[PDB]
Design a binder for this molecule. Structure first.
Ligand SMILES: Cc1ccnc(SC(F)(F)c2nc3ccccc3o2)n1
Ligand SMILES: [Ca+2]
Lengths: 410, 557
């Protein structure tokens, strides 16, 4: 009753090499937290010091658990994932229940600490290499690899699936209408129970886990409260030439996306070559057009479906005064979902919160995270994003230094 | 000697065999040298004679290299290197002296024959096999293999470094307040002990180093009072760049001008004010390396302004981790910027300059921010924390812009400092249409085949105009229409465009550009009292926008 278990053979993608990502410069306090965390991890047999014959790297970050309560170590396996993950989610994928988004309440439980139980395939360990940097490059820097399944990594939940099925089976049998979805270090638990009682069911579920390696796990999402109804058409919007012109542009564009946008009664009213600030010699058949048009904007884009074989991508615009608009689409403007996030300070604080919130929606909705287009300077995001990150995954990100009049439409 | 250190397992690249390169024939001289040298080597354990049982060979040769009229032995490891696994790192960052904490004493220790002092793997030695050749390849060569790290082998820098780090750990653990920096062959050792006891401690280190195979052939702790390293001169208590004689000529080749700029660029990390744009201007359209470029008047000013700053030496101080860092930035020149970082007022740890590029069109508030951002990264690397900034920008100037601007931003805590010139907004676009201002439906059109363009406008006041244009894209005829509106408009004006593109540029309130049509527009924009810019979509037959198209695309397309 005390030794290790037996390991699943793991292959990197067909003739692909491991990650050789540059570690990003980090703050002193974070370095400190990082060697302190890793000292334990090493003593607990989880990581070992590696030598120079391992050319691989994967960046590492430390984040605060809530705020100043503890430091967590976060590993960025985005690259390792890409080089493992055309071929997984296939040979050993985990299906996504459509029912999850339809549940009144979904609770996110971090079951990451479980993975630290199962040993990682000897010949795969070298790829999990990471480096604790030193300040000013004064010291070569502490290097490690993993011995057990690492938390950043998409292979972990894939391997662990079997244990999760057994662990979870009694519970599911006893509540066949609870929807439990595993995505990386978290379980998503969904149910149509009332809120307390939902929570009691979460607690009960927590005990099933606790018997197996999860050190008292973990939220609350109410998916059927996630709303579309965006692209707004003003109300005292039927006054000026400038109002109408703007309105027409808003519709002109919407008719790219949305089958049915009328706009013609509206192109009239303008008729002449007027000063921008003139109030209007029409407002009749057009107001009906406006009505109709508005009502098609409440509802889903008719033409557009989620294609599981395509990257979800997400745009975000800064609306100012703490508001942010966002779109999830697979091809530009065929929007799967559109939304808002508001804090009514910072800018990057709010953005990282936006991204996080969006990722979670995307996960509960489609079982993928989006590729984010971020309206910020790369350098600035790199410097600052870990300061507010709280999640255990990291989605891919581009930076989009442009925004059209796209900000306005939204 | 050879270190008792545990060897680093090394393997060839997947599915690849060791090198089997045929040894070319050498001159007698060179053979004799090779035999002599190898003997010494064989004697010291470095090398080992081997059978023809071993396949594999990597060519050897010999010459007078580093004026080596005692003869140096070379091994062409190209083939083995292509066949050896990548290793970690190689090395990939160096310290900046401004991060060093002040010491009473530092000394250099050069490791003896570092590479040759570290054992090679053993399961790998076989591949390092080489062959001293017979006089006229008539008879079998002498075959050796390496037992230590060879000179040009892919992994020798990484393994040596690795080996040295391990070796150093117990001594670092027993002496937690001594600072050791490993750089190639050298160790720099820094302490706050009194001259005598510091010398004791080096000797201990030397002793620890000898226990591990590594001679420091420097007895009595060699060095010399000012350390010269990676272009710096380092002292226990201050630091600087090392030379920087700027020659005195009437004629500068392109080459001379490059060297000169590199040098000034180097100096500028400790000499505040260094400036090189006029010197860089001379470099445009590289006109051959060997060719003389008459210094412009603007350049001669700079070169002298520079000699001025390098008149007397300046030294950076070192870092007290108990105090805050402060970063001061100053606008200086056009897209140019300069900065000082310091802790006690004006004892610069270091200095720098920034002269950006982050787009075709930009403005001062943007560029000051990108500079702030570059310094922020630089600070985290060097000192592991962020500096408190002092900035030539009003708090309200910055808040106005950034709360308005669509991209997001954040900078560390900062204060306004009145170091003229200040950053301001030369113009504010209006947020709403202007009552009683002439509305100018501007429009463009180009043929894209002939390149023939018409840019004009129509107004609500009935005013119209279309002027013809020639080598233009659809895009310039947008920017020309808008500019045409700004010339013929009063101080206040509304402008309707249908150019996503043109609206994009102007909305970002630029104050500078790599387009000439644009610097013009910005001139107009500054002079105006109120400009409102609105966007309608192309050829949707809109009131006002329709009519400009009837007479823009007539001669357009
Ligand atoms: C010269 C000086 C001044 C203050 N502290 C130090 S510490 C050091 F010697 F380890 C050290 N020597 C170095 C040489 C180059 C780069 C970093 C160094 O650190 N050194
Ligand atoms: Ca146009």
């Amino acid at each position: 009753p005390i030794s290790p278990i037996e390991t699943v053979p793991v292959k990197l993608k067909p003739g692909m090499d491991g990650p050789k990502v540059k570690q990003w410069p980090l703050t002193e306090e974070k370095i400190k937290a990082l060697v302190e965390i890793c000292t334990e991890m090493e003593k607990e047999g989880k990581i070992s010091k590696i030598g120079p014959e391992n050319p691989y790297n994967t960046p590492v970050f430390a984040i605060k658990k809530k705020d100043s309560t503890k430091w967590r170590k976060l590993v960025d396996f985005r690259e390792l994932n890409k080089r493992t993950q055309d071929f997984w989610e296939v040979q050993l994928g985990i299906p996504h229940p459509a029912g999850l988004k339809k549940k009144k309440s979904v609770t996110v439980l971090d079951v990451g600490d479980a993975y630290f139980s199962v040993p990682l395939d000897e010949d795969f360990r070298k790829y999990t290499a990471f480096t604790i940097p030193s300040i000013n490059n004064e010291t070569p820097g502490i290097r490690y690899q993993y011995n057990v399944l690492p938390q950043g990594w998409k292979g972990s939940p894939a391997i662990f699936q079997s244990s999760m099925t057994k662990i979870l089976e009694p519970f599911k049998k006893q509540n066949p209408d609870i929807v439990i979805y595993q995505y990386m270090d978290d379980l998503y638990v969904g149910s149509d129970l009332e809120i307390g009682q939902h929570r009691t069911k979460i607690e009960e579920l927590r005990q099933h886990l606790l018997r197996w390696g999860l050190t008292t796990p973990d939220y609350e999402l109410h998916p059927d409260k996630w709303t579309v109804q965006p692209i707004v058409l003003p109300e005292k919007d039927s006054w000026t030439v400038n109002d109408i012109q703007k309105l027409v542009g808003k519709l002109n564009w919407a008719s790219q996306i949305y089958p049915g946008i009328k706009v013609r009664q509206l192109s009239k009213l303008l008729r002449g070559t007027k000063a921008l600030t003139e109030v209007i010699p029409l407002t009749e058949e057009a107001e009906l057009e406006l009505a109709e048009n508005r009502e098609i904007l409440k509802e889903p884009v008719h033409g557009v479906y989620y294609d599981p074989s395509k990257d979800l991508i997400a745009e975000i615009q800064k609306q100012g005064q703490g508001q942010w608009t966002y779109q999830i689409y697979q091809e530009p403007f065929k929007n799967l979902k559109t939304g808002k996030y508001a804090r009514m300070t910072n800018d990057v604080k709010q953005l990282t919160e936006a991204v996080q919130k969006i990722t979670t929606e995307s996960i509960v909705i489609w079982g993928k995270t989006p590729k984010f287009k971020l309206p910020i300077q790369k350098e600035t995001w790199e410097t600052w994003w870990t300061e507010y990150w709280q999640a255990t995954w990291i989605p891919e990100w581009e930076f989009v230094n442009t925004p059209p009049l796209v900000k306005l439409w939204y | 000697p050879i270190s008792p250190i545990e060897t680093v397992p090394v393997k060839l690249k997947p599915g690849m065999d060791g090198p089997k390169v045929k040894q070319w024939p050498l001159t007698e001289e060179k053979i004799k040298a090779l035999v002599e040298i190898c003997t010494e080597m064989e004697k010291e354990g470095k090398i080992s004679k081997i059978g023809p049982e071993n396949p594999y060979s990597t060519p050897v040769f010999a010459i007078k290299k580093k004026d080596s009229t005692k003869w140096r032995k070379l091994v062409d490891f190209r083939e083995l290197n292509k066949r050896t696994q990548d290793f970690w790192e190689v090395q990939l960052g160096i310290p900046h002296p401004a991060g060093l904490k002040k010491k009473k004493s530092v000394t250099v220790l050069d490791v003896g024959d570092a590479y040759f002092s570290v054992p090679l793997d053993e399961d790998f030695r076989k591949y390092t096999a080489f062959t001293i050749p017979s006089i006229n390849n008539e008879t079998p060569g002498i075959r050796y293999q390496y037992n230590v790290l060879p000179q040009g082998w892919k992994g020798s820098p990484a393994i040596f470094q690795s080996s040295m780090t391990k070796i150093l750990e117990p001594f670092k653990k027993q002496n937690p307040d001594i600072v050791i920096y490993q750089y190639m062959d050298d160790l720099y050792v820094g302490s706050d002990l009194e001259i005598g006891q510091h010398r004791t401690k080096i000797e201990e280190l030397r002793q620890h180093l000898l226990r591990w195979g590594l001679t420091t052939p420097d007895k009595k702790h060699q060095k010399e009072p000012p350390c010269l390293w990676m272009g710096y001169e380092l002292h226990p208590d201050k630091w600087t760049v090392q030379p920087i004689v700027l020659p005195e000529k009437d004629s500068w080749t392109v080459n001379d001008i490059q060297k000169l700029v590199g040098k000034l660029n180097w100096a500028s990390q400790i000499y505040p004010g260094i400036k090189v744009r006029q010197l860089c201007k001379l470099l445009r359209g590289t006109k051959a390396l060997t060719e003389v470029i008459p210094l412009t008047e603007e350049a001669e000013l700079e070169l002298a302004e520079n000699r001025e700053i390098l008149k007397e030496p300046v030294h950076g101080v070192y870092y007290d981790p108990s105090k805050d860092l402060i970063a001061e930035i100053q606008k200086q020149g056009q897209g140019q910027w300069t900065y000082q970082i310091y802790q006690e007022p004006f004892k610069n740890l270091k200095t720098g300059k920034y002269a950006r590029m982050r787009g075709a069109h930009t403005n001062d508030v943007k560029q000051l921010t990108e500079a702030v951002q570059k310094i922020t990264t630089e600070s985290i690397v060097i000192w592991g924390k962020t500096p408190k900034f002092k900035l030539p920008i009003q708090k309200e100037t910055w808040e106005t812009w950034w709360t308005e601007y669509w991209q997001a931003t954040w900078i560390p805590e900062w204060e306004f400092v009145n170091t003229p010139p200040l950053v301001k907004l030369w113009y504010q676009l209006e947020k709403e249409p202007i009552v009683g201002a002439e509305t100018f439906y501007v429009d463009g059109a180009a043929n894209r085949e002939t390149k023939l363009g018409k840019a004009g406008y129509v107004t609500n006041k009935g005013r119209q105009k279309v002027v013809p244009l020639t080598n233009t894209t659809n895009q310039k005829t947008q920017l020309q229409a808008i500019y045409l509106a700004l010339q013929d408009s009063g101080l206040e004006v509304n402008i309707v465009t249908d150019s996503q593109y043109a609206l994009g540029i102007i909305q970002a309130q630029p104050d500078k550009s790599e387009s000439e049509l644009v610097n013009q527009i910005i001139e107009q924009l500054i002079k105006k009292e109120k400009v409102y810019l609105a966007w309608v979509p192309a050829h949707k037959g809109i009131g006002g926008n329709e009519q400009v198209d009837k007479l823009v695309s007539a001669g357009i397309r």
